[PDB]
Amino acid sequence: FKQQKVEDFYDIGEELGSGQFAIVKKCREKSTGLEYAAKFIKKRQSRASRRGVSREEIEREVSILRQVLHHNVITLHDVYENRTDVVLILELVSGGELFDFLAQKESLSEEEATSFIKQILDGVNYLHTKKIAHFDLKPENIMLLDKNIPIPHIKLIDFGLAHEIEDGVEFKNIFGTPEFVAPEIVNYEPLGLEADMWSIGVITYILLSGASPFLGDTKQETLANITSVSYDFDEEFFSHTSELAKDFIRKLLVKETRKRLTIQEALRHPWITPVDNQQAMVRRESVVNLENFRKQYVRRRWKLAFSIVSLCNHLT
């Protein structure tokens, strides 16, 4: 890593977000004028793992970001290091989440949904060809490079949980958002590239219905539904969903890792790449449920109106 000061080469600006022990801020390279995102990860380097990140995890994330070069995946530009943090200067992705963009649409067929899902699948395919598991695939990490074009460009971000799958070595751990993890994660079973496919299935379920397959009222219910593979296609949420989409999700949400679809098999599934004009027309006529999806969007619109009105009242 570069031991030089970040502020010597980059103008640091607004805060774009944060995580557990990392904070991302918009920045601009002084020598070029181009804009990037500086992710500051607080170094730990002490046995007490309560506050900070180990150097092993930081080096693993940086190595993964260096090995990855795809138009659907974020690209690492540079890395600096001072006495407290390690700063990853990454490609700026300023189009918000994919779901936040899809929600503000008027109508969404399954064809455009499959186009976005196929961008995601191309990213995951580039990652899996190099035997690199993402292990943190969720709508929060599906960003847009710009919401300024008709069909925006998808980027996969946050490689804090990415890990290299080596042949013949066992890698077990417990991480990620419970709503989107595979049964082998909750059961502390050997992990592989199949958990990414399970999370892609959950993401497709949520995109298609606005509901989550295994999400319960508590974490215990969620884990029990994941380990028991307990989900359904309720007609209240899946009235308009096609049969190909349900078959795709069903083939992605399987417990046994060897029977779960690989990324290439999902790329060749008829719902993503139709075989004949009949199923293509069926995927055209099928409409996604945009009501249960825009639920939270209109709720936050309500809350925004409330906040404006309350701030206006509080000052007079």
Binding site: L304, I308, S310
Partner: protein, 145 residues
């Protein structure tokens, strides 16, 4: 409230900042307050801005807006500010927010939303199903989530 503060930030700041320069002058706050029936004076707007003006530039920056939101949420009872917000929404004082009142408030705020979006807002807020928003439905829209 990382998620809620980020959402309210991105939305409320952009709704106030109708020219998009990164700051909020007294004129924008004045226009928003005048579209809501309030009539504050220039001195009052400057006093509002100065109580949070940390860098002393005359306008409200982003973290100053955040701290103003924090001081708003801290210096008042939740139920009372929710009641005042409802009284602002409900103009005729009948006790129910109809579609017309909600649309009027949203357009006064500066929102260019069609009738379908107002209908879906009313429906998402409507629990009993009468087509209007009770005070209880309002507070449950604003309650814990």
């Amino acid at each position: 409230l990382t998620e809620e503060q980020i959402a309210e930030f991105k939305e409320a700041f952009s709704l106030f900042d109708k020219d998009g320069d990164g700051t909020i002058t007294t004129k924008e706050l004045g226009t928003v307050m005048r579209s809501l029936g309030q009539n504050p004076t220039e001195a009052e707007l400057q006093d509002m801005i100065n109580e949070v003006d940390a860098d002393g530039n005359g306008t409200i920056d982003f973290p100053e807006f955040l701290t103003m939101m924090a001081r708003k949420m801290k210096d008042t009872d939740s139920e009372e500010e929710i009641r005042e917000a409802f009284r602002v929404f409900d103009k005729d004082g009948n006790g129910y927010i109809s579609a017309a009142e909600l649309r009027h408030v949203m357009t006064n705020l500066g929102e260019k939303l069609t009738d379908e979006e107002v209908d879906e807002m009313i429906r998402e807020a409507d629990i009993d199903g009468d087509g209007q928003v009770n005070y209880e439905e309002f507070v449950q829209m604003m309650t814990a989530k």
